[PDB]
Each structure stands twice: as C-alpha cells, then as structure tokens.
Design a protein around this ligand. Structure first.
Ligand SMILES: NC(=O)[C@H]1C=CCN([C@@H]2O[C@H](COP(=O)(O)OP(=O)(O)OC[C@H]3O[C@H](n4cnc5c(N)ncnc54)[C@H](O)[C@H]3O)[C@@H](O)[C@H]2O)C1
Ligand SMILES: Cc1cc2nc3c(=O)[nH]c(=O)nc-3n(C[C@H](O)[C@H](O)[C@H](O)COP(=O)(O)O)c2cc1C
Length: 362
C-alpha cells in the first residue's frame, strides 16, 4: 500500500499519506475554538499523520458560516493552542486553513450588518442559498467591490492570521483559494469583471492570490505555507472560461514565489469535481507543472487514493466526508476495513457531540 509509505513534506516527516481535508463543522461557538474541536481532531490524529483544520476566520468580515473559528483575536489563539497541543500530543502535523468567504456571506454574519466584500458587485445568483444561523437558508446579498487599498488590508489580515497560527503552535497554514470564496472571486473570470490591475488578464486575476502567498511566506516561511485552489469547481457561480489555463497560471506564480524565496512551499492542494479521464488529466497537468508536493482531493476513496500515489498523480491524498464519519479512517484504509456512513444533516450543526465526536471507532 503506497498510501503508507513515508513522505518528506519539507521539514515535516509524514508516516502516511492520508490527510484530513479541511471541513467546516460549525462547532466553534461564537467563533471561539471549543474543547469539542480538540476532541474531534484528536480522534482523527495519528502518529505522523497530517491534519488541516476547518476554514478559520482572518477578520471579523471573513465569515459566511455560523460558528466558524477565528484566529484574529488573542482569545482565539489561546483556545487554538490547547487544541494544537492535544493534536501534537498524538504526533500529528496540523495546519490551520485561513478562510475568507468574500461575497459568500450575509448581513447576519457581518459587523453592523454591512455588505460582504468581493472583487465585484455581482452577487451569487438565486440558485445558491446561504445557510442561516437558525438553520434556514437565506439569499446572498449584493457585495461591495473593494479598491486596491482594501485589497492590501485583506492581505495584511492574512499575514497577521498566519503569525497568530504560529503563535498558537500550528505547524503551518493553508491559504483557502478555492470553492468560490474571496480568492476564487479574484481568480475566476466569470466573477472578476474588474478593469484595474486586479482584473482582466490571467496575470491580473492572479495578483490577489500571489500577494496573499508572498505576504504569509515572508512572515512565517515558505515551508509552512500550503495553497488550495479549485479552478474546475463552479461552486457559488465561480466558473472560468479556461480552468486549465487558470490553474497553470496559478502554478506558474507559485513556482516563481518559491524561486524568489529560496524555499519550496509546503504543498499545493487542488480539489477536483466528480469526463473522469479529462478531470484526471487536468489534475495530472497541474501536478506535473508544480515543483513541489501535490495533494489531490475530491471524491477520493481507498482504491482511488492508492492509485493516485502509485501512478505518481499525487504525493498526498486528503479525505473529507469519509473522515467525518470515520475517526480512525487512516486505520481503516490500512486494514481495508468497512467504512461508516456520514449524516449530512449534522454537518453544520452546533452540538459538540452529536454528529461530531459520536462516530464510532472500529
Ligand atoms: N468552506 C468550504 O470551502 C466548503 C463549504 C461548503 C461545501 N464545500 C464544497 O461545496 C461544494 C458543493 O457543496 P455540496 O454539494 O456538498 O452541498 P449541497 O449543494 O448543499 O449538497 C463541494 O465541492 C464541497 O466540497 C466547500
Ligand atoms: C461539511 C463540509 C465542510 C467543508 N469545509 C471545507 C472548508 O472549510 N474548507 C475547504 O477548503 N473545503 C471544505 N470542504 C470540502 C472538503 O475539503 C471536501 O470534502 C474534500 O475536498 C473532498 O471531498 P470528499 O473527500 O468528501 O469526497 C468541506 C466539505 C464538507 C462536506
């Protein structure tokens, strides 16, 4: 089983290649990491295993889900440290995913009920609905297109949150530039209608994610910075006319950043939608073009993950919904043991146990 051959993820010696994909669970009440988060991540941590936390707020204006943890205040850092210490006690490497939703928010989630920010004024169409704090579904409002000065301020929010995660003991951070959120709102030409230096060409649409990466790389180091993108996923009306060209453009900037910094990034993380061969060739092209560690994600199983590593399609494989319902998913993949079903009803609920930590072990 190649999924259990060790891998050198920079200065992090990993014992296996099963990664916990970042998953918003909405158990961090009032954006404060709770003790239930420590138990949730401890159940899934393994010796030498790699975990990526749920999307974490970088600023009071970055949330678009209820009870998502933050890392922009000191109480959040203090509460995050207790969870990191528990995860590190099991011998696992843990990265904190920095998350800004952009236009994928609502007045209820914004300070003073203000409008969400984005690269544009286009709202998410009435097809997609946002989960409300009371369990209902609301309407995505019209966002506020930000100028370049506010862009540099959001970049600073990433840089401060990256340092805060290191203060909390995190081994590194992951930039969430996928799934149609703030960074993806600057990347996809189906959203980015800007006429300034941040819109138009591939280079201008890549300027935001580039500036975000260099800021956190120069703050904490390249080997502790992961990047996640999804050029072929049209979540929240985030479509591009040429996803492969967009992905190759991002890979080109990431390679240039590693050259100027004299060090390689932690990894490149790409999620794919579920033609299978065309989607596989897209993932293979991005992997071949990026000089560094590649993590594949999106509908991966035990059989599909083994072949991804065996054929050289990826260095690490991250699992999502299967890790929700299988706390010992790494052990189940090793033994080829049957997997537990997950309940989509308790994906975003607030109970610290029900649908969170009560999924049974083997
Ligand atoms: N914070 C995030 O990045 C995640 C938040 C919500 C769900 N994530 C992604 O949304 C996409 C569609 O959501 P899904 O299909 O799971 O939700 P429904 O459409 O309600 O079913 C999938 O690619 C999934 O991985 C992304
Ligand atoms: C409940 C839930 C929450 C998620 N939250 C996040 C998130 O916060 N950030 C992110 O980048 N991806 C998030 N995702 C996407 C997962 O990473 C996704 O499950 C993974 O990319 C591959 O899906 P699979 O392994 O379940 O097939 C989430 C997915 C689910 C189902």
């Amino acid at each position: 089983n190649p999924l259990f051959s060790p891998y050198k993820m920079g200065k992090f010696n990993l014992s296996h290649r099963v990664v916990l994909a970042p998953m918003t669970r909405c158990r961090a009440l009032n954006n404060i990491p709770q003790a239930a988060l420590g138990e949730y991540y401890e159940q899934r941590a393994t010796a030498g295993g790699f975990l990526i936390t749920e999307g974490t707020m970088i600023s009071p204006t970055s949330a678009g889900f209820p009870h998502v943890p933050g890392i922009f205040t000191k109480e959040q850092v203090r509460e995050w440290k207790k969870i990191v210490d528990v995860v590190h006690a099991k011998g696992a490497v843990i990265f904190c995913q920095l998350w800004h939703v952009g236009r994928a928010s609502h007045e209820v989630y914004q300070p003073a009920g203000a409008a969400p920010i984005s690269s544009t004024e286009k709202p998410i169409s009435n097809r997609w609905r946002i989960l409300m704090p009371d369990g209902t579904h609301g309407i995505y409002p019209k966002p506020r297109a930000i100028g370049t000065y506010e862009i540099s301020q959001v970049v600073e929010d990433y840089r401060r949150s990256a340092l805060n995660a290191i203060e909390a003991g995190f081994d590194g951070i992951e930039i969430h530039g996928a799934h149609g959120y703030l960074i993806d709102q600057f990347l996809k030409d189906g959203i980015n209608d800007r006429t300034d230096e941040y819109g138009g060409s591939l280079a201008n649409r890549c300027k935001f994610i580039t500036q975000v990466v260099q800021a956190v790389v120069s703050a904490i180091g390249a080997d502790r910075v992961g990047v996640r993108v999804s050029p072929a996923i049209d979540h929240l009306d985030a479509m591009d006319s040429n996803p492969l060209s967009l992905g190759l453009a991002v890979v080109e900037r990431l390679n240039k950043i590693q050259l100027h910094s004299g060090s390689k990034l932690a990894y490149l993380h790409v999620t794919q939608p579920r033609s299978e061969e065309e989607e596989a060739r897209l993932m293979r092209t991005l992997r071949n073009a990026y000089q560094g560690t590649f993590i594949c994600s999106g509908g991966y199983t035990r059989e599909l993950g083994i072949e991804a590593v065996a054929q050289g399609d990826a260095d690490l494989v991250s699992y999502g919904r299967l890790f929700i319902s299988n706390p010992d998913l790494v052990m189940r993949i090793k033994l080829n043991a049957p997997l537990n079903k997950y309940n989509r009803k308790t994906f975003y609920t607030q109970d610290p146990v029900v649908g969170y930590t009560d999924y049974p072990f083997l």
